Amino acid sequence: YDIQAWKKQCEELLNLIFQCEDSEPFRQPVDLLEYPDYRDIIDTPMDFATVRETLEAGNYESPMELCKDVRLIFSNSKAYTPSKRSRIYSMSLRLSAFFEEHISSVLSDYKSALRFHKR
């Protein structure tokens, strides 16, 4: 029922994501010299360094907000990919599965802790 525990749990999960080769495309912004049309397709860029920095700044109030930004990394990859078989998009899908598998208990625990707080 620790309503703060999500933050370290998210730091640890981000650490695991940064050890994962599948995250390499998603740890920094898209170089427009490499992908010149990227901002024609993607309105709101997001990467794992931005997520980590926002968490470390104390600018997430809840793991739900962190989860929204991580899911934006994946939806941006799906929207930008030219093919559902593209290397970088395929990496996004494995990393999304990994993330969702691990974030589910973080979200459940937080929400249960907030319900207990308000009981």
Site residues, ligand Y47 (CB under 6 A): 24-26, 28, 30-31, 34-35, 76-77, 80-81, 86, 88-89, 92
Is the Cα torsion angle 48, 53, 54, 55 positive or negative in sign?
positive
Write down the least CB distance from residue 106 to ligand Y47, Å: 24
Q: Which is nearer to ligand Y47, 5 or 42 (CB)?
A: 42
Kindly tell me which of 80 and 110 has the beta carbon lying closer to ligand Y47. Answer: 80
The answer for residues whose C-beta is within 8 angstroms of residue 18's C-beta and 6 or more apart is 27, 48, 52
Q: Which helix (H) or strand (E) holds 66?
A: helix 63-80
Smallest gap from Cβ 53 to ligand Y47, in A, equals: 16
Residue 28 CB neighbours (<10 A): 11
Minimum Å distance from CB 77 to ligand Y47?
Answer: 3
Q: How far apart are CA 78 and CA 88, in angstroms?
A: 9
Residue closer to ligand Y47, measured from CB, 42 or 113: 42
Whichever of 9 and 23 has its CB closer to ligand Y47, that residue is 23
